[PDB]
Amino acid sequence: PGSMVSEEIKAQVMESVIGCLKLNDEQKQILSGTTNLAKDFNLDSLDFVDLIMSLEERFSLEISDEDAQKLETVDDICRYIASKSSDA
């Protein structure tokens, strides 16, 4: 359901999120790129912070307060991070 997206970063964002909120076999089996990990998993404002900060420092990306305002779903996030990178 998405190839144009940065498959390289996709593994990093997903790998960080999984361990960020510690997902189980079920959550990992019921996860998807078009699934708001914030609403679906009902992540806490604290977790989200560590998430954006983790990926931000990871790819040394420059994320703002409003930028994240439109980044809740995996696809959306990965897309925003990919658009900043070079890898297709």
Side-chain angles (χ1 to χ4, degrees):
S3 44
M4 302 173 99
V5 189
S6 270
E7 270 189 295
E8 190 88 30
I9 314 184
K10 208 279 192 199
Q12 282 265 256
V13 293
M14 68 94 181
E15 172 166 283
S16 196
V17 173
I18 294 155
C20 258
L21 23 154
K22 288 150 86 71
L23 282 303
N24 315 324
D25 314 321
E26 285 200 278
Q27 311 318 88
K28 299 152 149 266
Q29 273 206 297
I30 62 101
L31 221 148
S32 150
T34 69
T35 300
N36 192 353
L37 315 169
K39 207 152 61 164
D40 206 49
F41 293 125
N42 208 251
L43 287 173
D44 195 28
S45 58
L46 302 162
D47 241 33
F48 201 79
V49 176
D50 285 27
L51 265 152
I52 54 184
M53 286 225 61
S54 276
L55 270 169
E56 181 201 346
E57 70 174 24
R58 181 98 212 79
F59 293 84
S60 318
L61 178 61
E62 278 164 331
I63 306 170
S64 313
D65 211 57
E66 264 200 34
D67 305 350
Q69 228 183 255
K70 76 227 277 208
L71 297 183
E72 45 276 305
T73 39
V74 188
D75 189 88
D76 282 0
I77 301 151
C78 200
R79 202 284 206 168
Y80 172 93
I81 302 179
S83 164
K84 303 271 184 274
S85 195
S86 201
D87 207 332

mmCIF file of all heavy atoms in Angstrom, residues 44-79:
data_model
loop_
_atom_site.group_PDB
_atom_site.id
_atom_site.type_symbol
_atom_site.label_atom_id
_atom_site.label_comp_id
_atom_site.label_asym_id
_atom_site.label_seq_id
_atom_site.Cartn_x
_atom_site.Cartn_y
_atom_site.Cartn_z
ATOM 1 N N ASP A 44 0.425 8.509 24.455
ATOM 2 C CA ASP A 44 0.394 9.653 25.359
ATOM 3 C C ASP A 44 1.232 10.803 24.808
ATOM 4 O O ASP A 44 2.163 10.590 24.031
ATOM 5 C CB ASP A 44 0.904 9.252 26.743
ATOM 6 C CG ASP A 44 0.551 10.271 27.808
ATOM 7 O OD1 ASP A 44 -0.474 10.967 27.648
ATOM 8 O OD2 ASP A 44 1.298 10.372 28.803
ATOM 9 N N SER A 45 0.894 12.023 25.215
ATOM 10 C CA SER A 45 1.613 13.207 24.759
ATOM 11 C C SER A 45 3.106 13.081 25.044
ATOM 12 O O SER A 45 3.934 13.685 24.362
ATOM 13 C CB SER A 45 1.056 14.460 25.439
ATOM 14 O OG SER A 45 1.139 14.354 26.849
ATOM 15 N N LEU A 46 3.443 12.290 26.057
ATOM 16 C CA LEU A 46 4.837 12.082 26.435
ATOM 17 C C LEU A 46 5.552 11.200 25.416
ATOM 18 O O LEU A 46 6.644 11.528 24.953
ATOM 19 C CB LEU A 46 4.921 11.447 27.823
ATOM 20 C CG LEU A 46 4.262 12.229 28.960
ATOM 21 C CD1 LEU A 46 4.030 11.330 30.164
ATOM 22 C CD2 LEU A 46 5.115 13.430 29.345
ATOM 23 N N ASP A 47 4.926 10.081 25.069
ATOM 24 C CA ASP A 47 5.500 9.152 24.102
ATOM 25 C C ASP A 47 5.733 9.840 22.760
ATOM 26 O O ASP A 47 6.814 9.738 22.178
ATOM 27 C CB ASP A 47 4.582 7.942 23.916
ATOM 28 C CG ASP A 47 5.256 6.640 24.298
ATOM 29 O OD1 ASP A 47 6.095 6.654 25.223
ATOM 30 O OD2 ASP A 47 4.945 5.605 23.672
ATOM 31 N N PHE A 48 4.713 10.539 22.275
ATOM 32 C CA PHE A 48 4.805 11.242 21.000
ATOM 33 C C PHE A 48 6.044 12.133 20.960
ATOM 34 O O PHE A 48 6.777 12.151 19.972
ATOM 35 C CB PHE A 48 3.550 12.084 20.765
ATOM 36 C CG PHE A 48 3.327 12.440 19.323
ATOM 37 C CD1 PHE A 48 2.785 11.516 18.444
ATOM 38 C CD2 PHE A 48 3.659 13.697 18.847
ATOM 39 C CE1 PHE A 48 2.578 11.839 17.116
ATOM 40 C CE2 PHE A 48 3.455 14.027 17.520
ATOM 41 C CZ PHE A 48 2.915 13.096 16.654
ATOM 42 N N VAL A 49 6.268 12.873 22.041
ATOM 43 C CA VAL A 49 7.417 13.766 22.131
ATOM 44 C C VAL A 49 8.720 13.013 21.888
ATOM 45 O O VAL A 49 9.532 13.409 21.053
ATOM 46 C CB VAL A 49 7.485 14.459 23.505
ATOM 47 C CG1 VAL A 49 8.744 15.305 23.616
ATOM 48 C CG2 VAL A 49 6.242 15.305 23.736
ATOM 49 N N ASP A 50 8.912 11.924 22.626
ATOM 50 C CA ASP A 50 10.116 11.113 22.491
ATOM 51 C C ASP A 50 10.233 10.544 21.080
ATOM 52 O O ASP A 50 11.336 10.340 20.571
ATOM 53 C CB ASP A 50 10.108 9.975 23.514
ATOM 54 C CG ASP A 50 10.417 10.458 24.918
ATOM 55 O OD1 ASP A 50 10.132 11.635 25.217
ATOM 56 O OD2 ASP A 50 10.946 9.656 25.717
ATOM 57 N N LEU A 51 9.090 10.289 20.455
ATOM 58 C CA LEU A 51 9.063 9.742 19.102
ATOM 59 C C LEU A 51 9.613 10.749 18.097
ATOM 60 O O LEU A 51 10.584 10.471 17.392
ATOM 61 C CB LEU A 51 7.636 9.348 18.718
ATOM 62 C CG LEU A 51 7.261 7.882 18.940
ATOM 63 C CD1 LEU A 51 5.768 7.745 19.192
ATOM 64 C CD2 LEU A 51 7.683 7.037 17.746
ATOM 65 N N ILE A 52 8.987 11.919 18.037
ATOM 66 C CA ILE A 52 9.415 12.969 17.122
ATOM 67 C C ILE A 52 10.862 13.370 17.384
ATOM 68 O O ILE A 52 11.621 13.641 16.453
ATOM 69 C CB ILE A 52 8.520 14.216 17.235
ATOM 70 C CG1 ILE A 52 8.459 14.697 18.685
ATOM 71 C CG2 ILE A 52 7.123 13.914 16.712
ATOM 72 C CD1 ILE A 52 7.518 15.863 18.898
ATOM 73 N N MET A 53 11.240 13.406 18.658
ATOM 74 C CA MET A 53 12.597 13.771 19.043
ATOM 75 C C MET A 53 13.592 12.699 18.611
ATOM 76 O O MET A 53 14.695 13.008 18.159
ATOM 77 C CB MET A 53 12.682 13.983 20.555
ATOM 78 C CG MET A 53 12.036 15.276 21.026
ATOM 79 S SD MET A 53 13.049 16.162 22.226
ATOM 80 C CE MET A 53 14.526 16.471 21.261
ATOM 81 N N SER A 54 13.197 11.438 18.755
ATOM 82 C CA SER A 54 14.056 10.320 18.383
ATOM 83 C C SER A 54 14.361 10.342 16.889
ATOM 84 O O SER A 54 15.521 10.310 16.478
ATOM 85 C CB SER A 54 13.395 8.994 18.762
ATOM 86 O OG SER A 54 13.645 8.667 20.118
ATOM 87 N N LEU A 55 13.308 10.397 16.079
ATOM 88 C CA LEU A 55 13.461 10.423 14.627
ATOM 89 C C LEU A 55 14.160 11.702 14.176
ATOM 90 O O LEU A 55 14.967 11.684 13.248
ATOM 91 C CB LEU A 55 12.095 10.309 13.950
ATOM 92 C CG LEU A 55 11.614 8.890 13.642
ATOM 93 C CD1 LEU A 55 10.150 8.899 13.232
ATOM 94 C CD2 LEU A 55 12.472 8.260 12.554
ATOM 95 N N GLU A 56 13.845 12.809 14.843
ATOM 96 C CA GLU A 56 14.444 14.096 14.510
ATOM 97 C C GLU A 56 15.965 14.036 14.632
ATOM 98 O O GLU A 56 16.686 14.405 13.706
ATOM 99 C CB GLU A 56 13.891 15.192 15.423
ATOM 100 C CG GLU A 56 14.452 16.572 15.126
ATOM 101 C CD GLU A 56 14.315 17.524 16.298
ATOM 102 O OE1 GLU A 56 13.555 17.202 17.236
ATOM 103 O OE2 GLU A 56 14.965 18.589 16.279
ATOM 104 N N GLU A 57 16.442 13.569 15.782
ATOM 105 C CA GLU A 57 17.876 13.463 16.026
ATOM 106 C C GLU A 57 18.486 12.334 15.199
ATOM 107 O O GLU A 57 19.657 12.388 14.824
ATOM 108 C CB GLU A 57 18.146 13.225 17.513
ATOM 109 C CG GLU A 57 17.721 11.849 17.996
ATOM 110 C CD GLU A 57 18.133 11.581 19.431
ATOM 111 O OE1 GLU A 57 18.321 12.557 20.187
ATOM 112 O OE2 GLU A 57 18.268 10.395 19.797
ATOM 113 N N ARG A 58 17.683 11.312 14.921
ATOM 114 C CA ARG A 58 18.142 10.169 14.141
ATOM 115 C C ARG A 58 18.582 10.605 12.746
ATOM 116 O O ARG A 58 19.725 10.381 12.346
ATOM 117 C CB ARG A 58 17.036 9.120 14.034
ATOM 118 C CG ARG A 58 17.447 7.879 13.257
ATOM 119 C CD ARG A 58 17.872 6.754 14.188
ATOM 120 N NE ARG A 58 18.917 5.921 13.597
ATOM 121 C CZ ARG A 58 20.199 6.265 13.562
ATOM 122 N NH1 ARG A 58 20.594 7.420 14.082
ATOM 123 N NH2 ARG A 58 21.090 5.454 13.007
ATOM 124 N N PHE A 59 17.667 11.228 12.010
ATOM 125 C CA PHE A 59 17.960 11.692 10.659
ATOM 126 C C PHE A 59 18.379 13.160 10.668
ATOM 127 O O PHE A 59 18.475 13.795 9.619
ATOM 128 C CB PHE A 59 16.739 11.504 9.757
ATOM 129 C CG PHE A 59 16.399 10.063 9.503
ATOM 130 C CD1 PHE A 59 15.630 9.349 10.407
ATOM 131 C CD2 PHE A 59 16.848 9.423 8.359
ATOM 132 C CE1 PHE A 59 15.314 8.024 10.177
ATOM 133 C CE2 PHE A 59 16.534 8.098 8.121
ATOM 134 C CZ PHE A 59 15.768 7.397 9.032
ATOM 135 N N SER A 60 18.624 13.692 11.861
ATOM 136 C CA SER A 60 19.027 15.085 12.009
ATOM 137 C C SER A 60 18.065 16.010 11.270
ATOM 138 O O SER A 60 18.455 17.075 10.790
ATOM 139 C CB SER A 60 20.451 15.284 11.482
ATOM 140 O OG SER A 60 21.296 14.221 11.883
ATOM 141 N N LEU A 61 16.807 15.596 11.184
ATOM 142 C CA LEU A 61 15.786 16.387 10.504
ATOM 143 C C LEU A 61 15.343 17.562 11.369
ATOM 144 O O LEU A 61 15.459 17.523 12.593
ATOM 145 C CB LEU A 61 14.581 15.511 10.157
ATOM 146 C CG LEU A 61 13.410 16.220 9.476
ATOM 147 C CD1 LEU A 61 13.847 16.822 8.150
ATOM 148 C CD2 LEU A 61 12.250 15.256 9.270
ATOM 149 N N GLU A 62 14.832 18.606 10.723
ATOM 150 C CA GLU A 62 14.370 19.793 11.433
ATOM 151 C C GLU A 62 12.845 19.831 11.494
ATOM 152 O O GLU A 62 12.189 20.307 10.567
ATOM 153 C CB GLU A 62 14.896 21.059 10.755
ATOM 154 C CG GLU A 62 16.323 21.408 11.142
ATOM 155 C CD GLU A 62 16.956 22.409 10.195
ATOM 156 O OE1 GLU A 62 16.579 22.419 9.004
ATOM 157 O OE2 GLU A 62 17.828 23.182 10.643
ATOM 158 N N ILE A 63 12.290 19.326 12.590
ATOM 159 C CA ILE A 63 10.844 19.302 12.771
ATOM 160 C C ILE A 63 10.383 20.447 13.666
ATOM 161 O O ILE A 63 11.067 20.815 14.622
ATOM 162 C CB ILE A 63 10.374 17.968 13.380
ATOM 163 C CG1 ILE A 63 10.875 16.793 12.539
ATOM 164 C CG2 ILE A 63 8.857 17.940 13.489
ATOM 165 C CD1 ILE A 63 10.671 15.447 13.197
ATOM 166 N N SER A 64 9.219 21.006 13.353
ATOM 167 C CA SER A 64 8.667 22.112 14.127
ATOM 168 C C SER A 64 7.408 21.678 14.870
ATOM 169 O O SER A 64 7.029 20.507 14.843
ATOM 170 C CB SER A 64 8.352 23.297 13.212
ATOM 171 O OG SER A 64 9.436 23.573 12.344
ATOM 172 N N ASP A 65 6.764 22.631 15.535
ATOM 173 C CA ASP A 65 5.545 22.351 16.286
ATOM 174 C C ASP A 65 4.355 22.180 15.346
ATOM 175 O O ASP A 65 3.526 21.292 15.537
ATOM 176 C CB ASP A 65 5.266 23.474 17.284
ATOM 177 C CG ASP A 65 4.554 22.980 18.529
ATOM 178 O OD1 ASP A 65 5.089 22.070 19.196
ATOM 179 O OD2 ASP A 65 3.461 23.502 18.834
ATOM 180 N N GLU A 66 4.279 23.039 14.334
ATOM 181 C CA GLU A 66 3.188 22.983 13.368
ATOM 182 C C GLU A 66 3.376 21.815 12.403
ATOM 183 O O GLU A 66 2.404 21.219 11.937
ATOM 184 C CB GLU A 66 3.104 24.296 12.586
ATOM 185 C CG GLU A 66 2.089 25.276 13.150
ATOM 186 C CD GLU A 66 1.657 26.317 12.138
ATOM 187 O OE1 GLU A 66 1.576 25.981 10.937
ATOM 188 O OE2 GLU A 66 1.400 27.471 12.545
ATOM 189 N N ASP A 67 4.631 21.495 12.108
ATOM 190 C CA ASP A 67 4.946 20.399 11.200
ATOM 191 C C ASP A 67 4.325 19.093 11.687
ATOM 192 O O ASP A 67 3.704 18.363 10.914
ATOM 193 C CB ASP A 67 6.462 20.238 11.067
ATOM 194 C CG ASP A 67 7.144 21.520 10.631
ATOM 195 O OD1 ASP A 67 6.430 22.474 10.258
ATOM 196 O OD2 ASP A 67 8.391 21.569 10.662
ATOM 197 N N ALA A 68 4.498 18.804 12.972
ATOM 198 C CA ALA A 68 3.954 17.589 13.562
ATOM 199 C C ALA A 68 2.432 17.652 13.647
ATOM 200 O O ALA A 68 1.762 16.622 13.706
ATOM 201 C CB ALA A 68 4.552 17.358 14.942
ATOM 202 N N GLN A 69 1.895 18.868 13.654
ATOM 203 C CA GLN A 69 0.453 19.065 13.733
ATOM 204 C C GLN A 69 -0.259 18.338 12.596
ATOM 205 O O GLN A 69 -1.439 18.003 12.702
ATOM 206 C CB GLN A 69 0.117 20.557 13.690
ATOM 207 C CG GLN A 69 -0.854 20.993 14.774
ATOM 208 C CD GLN A 69 -1.225 22.460 14.669
ATOM 209 O OE1 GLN A 69 -0.750 23.289 15.446
ATOM 210 N NE2 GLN A 69 -2.078 22.787 13.706
ATOM 211 N N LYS A 70 0.465 18.099 11.509
ATOM 212 C CA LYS A 70 -0.095 17.411 10.351
ATOM 213 C C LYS A 70 0.535 16.032 10.180
ATOM 214 O O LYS A 70 0.375 15.391 9.141
ATOM 215 C CB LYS A 70 0.120 18.242 9.085
ATOM 216 C CG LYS A 70 1.542 18.186 8.554
ATOM 217 C CD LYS A 70 2.064 19.571 8.209
ATOM 218 C CE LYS A 70 1.604 20.011 6.828
ATOM 219 N NZ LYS A 70 2.560 20.969 6.205
ATOM 220 N N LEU A 71 1.250 15.582 11.206
ATOM 221 C CA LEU A 71 1.902 14.277 11.169
ATOM 222 C C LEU A 71 1.422 13.396 12.317
ATOM 223 O O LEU A 71 1.908 13.507 13.442
ATOM 224 C CB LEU A 71 3.421 14.444 11.239
ATOM 225 C CG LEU A 71 4.068 15.199 10.077
ATOM 226 C CD1 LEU A 71 5.581 15.220 10.231
ATOM 227 C CD2 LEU A 71 3.675 14.572 8.748
ATOM 228 N N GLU A 72 0.466 12.519 12.024
ATOM 229 C CA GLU A 72 -0.078 11.618 13.032
ATOM 230 C C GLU A 72 0.004 10.167 12.566
ATOM 231 O O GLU A 72 0.271 9.262 13.357
ATOM 232 C CB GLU A 72 -1.530 11.983 13.344
ATOM 233 C CG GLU A 72 -2.368 12.258 12.107
ATOM 234 C CD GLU A 72 -2.213 13.679 11.600
ATOM 235 O OE1 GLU A 72 -2.427 14.618 12.396
ATOM 236 O OE2 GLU A 72 -1.878 13.852 10.410
ATOM 237 N N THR A 73 -0.227 9.953 11.274
ATOM 238 C CA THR A 73 -0.182 8.613 10.702
ATOM 239 C C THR A 73 1.235 8.243 10.282
ATOM 240 O O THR A 73 2.076 9.115 10.061
ATOM 241 C CB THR A 73 -1.116 8.491 9.482
ATOM 242 O OG1 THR A 73 -1.071 9.696 8.709
ATOM 243 C CG2 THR A 73 -2.545 8.216 9.921
ATOM 244 N N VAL A 74 1.494 6.943 10.171
ATOM 245 C CA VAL A 74 2.811 6.458 9.776
ATOM 246 C C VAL A 74 3.193 6.971 8.392
ATOM 247 O O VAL A 74 4.253 7.570 8.212
ATOM 248 C CB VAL A 74 2.864 4.918 9.771
ATOM 249 C CG1 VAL A 74 4.288 4.433 9.549
ATOM 250 C CG2 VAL A 74 2.299 4.364 11.072
ATOM 251 N N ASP A 75 2.322 6.733 7.417
ATOM 252 C CA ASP A 75 2.567 7.173 6.049
ATOM 253 C C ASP A 75 2.890 8.664 6.007
ATOM 254 O O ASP A 75 3.876 9.078 5.397
ATOM 255 C CB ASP A 75 1.351 6.878 5.170
ATOM 256 C CG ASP A 75 1.631 7.104 3.698
ATOM 257 O OD1 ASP A 75 2.099 6.158 3.030
ATOM 258 O OD2 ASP A 75 1.384 8.227 3.212
ATOM 259 N N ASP A 76 2.052 9.464 6.656
ATOM 260 C CA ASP A 76 2.249 10.908 6.693
ATOM 261 C C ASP A 76 3.629 11.256 7.245
ATOM 262 O O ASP A 76 4.370 12.031 6.642
ATOM 263 C CB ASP A 76 1.165 11.571 7.545
ATOM 264 C CG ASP A 76 -0.151 11.704 6.805
ATOM 265 O OD1 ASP A 76 -0.216 11.287 5.630
ATOM 266 O OD2 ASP A 76 -1.117 12.227 7.401
ATOM 267 N N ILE A 77 3.964 10.677 8.393
ATOM 268 C CA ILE A 77 5.254 10.925 9.024
ATOM 269 C C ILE A 77 6.402 10.528 8.104
ATOM 270 O O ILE A 77 7.278 11.338 7.800
ATOM 271 C CB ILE A 77 5.387 10.158 10.353
ATOM 272 C CG1 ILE A 77 4.280 10.579 11.323
ATOM 273 C CG2 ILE A 77 6.757 10.399 10.968
ATOM 274 C CD1 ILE A 77 3.884 9.491 12.297
ATOM 275 N N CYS A 78 6.392 9.275 7.661
ATOM 276 C CA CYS A 78 7.433 8.770 6.773
ATOM 277 C C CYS A 78 7.564 9.648 5.534
ATOM 278 O O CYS A 78 8.669 9.895 5.051
ATOM 279 C CB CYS A 78 7.126 7.329 6.363
ATOM 280 S SG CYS A 78 8.561 6.411 5.760
ATOM 281 N N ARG A 79 6.429 10.114 5.022
ATOM 282 C CA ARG A 79 6.417 10.962 3.836
ATOM 283 C C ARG A 79 7.135 12.280 4.104
ATOM 284 O O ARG A 79 7.958 12.725 3.304
ATOM 285 C CB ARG A 79 4.978 11.232 3.392
ATOM 286 C CG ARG A 79 4.858 11.633 1.930
ATOM 287 C CD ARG A 79 5.299 13.071 1.708
ATOM 288 N NE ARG A 79 4.658 13.667 0.539
ATOM 289 C CZ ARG A 79 4.689 14.967 0.266
ATOM 290 N NH1 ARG A 79 5.327 15.802 1.074
ATOM 291 N NH2 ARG A 79 4.081 15.432 -0.817
#
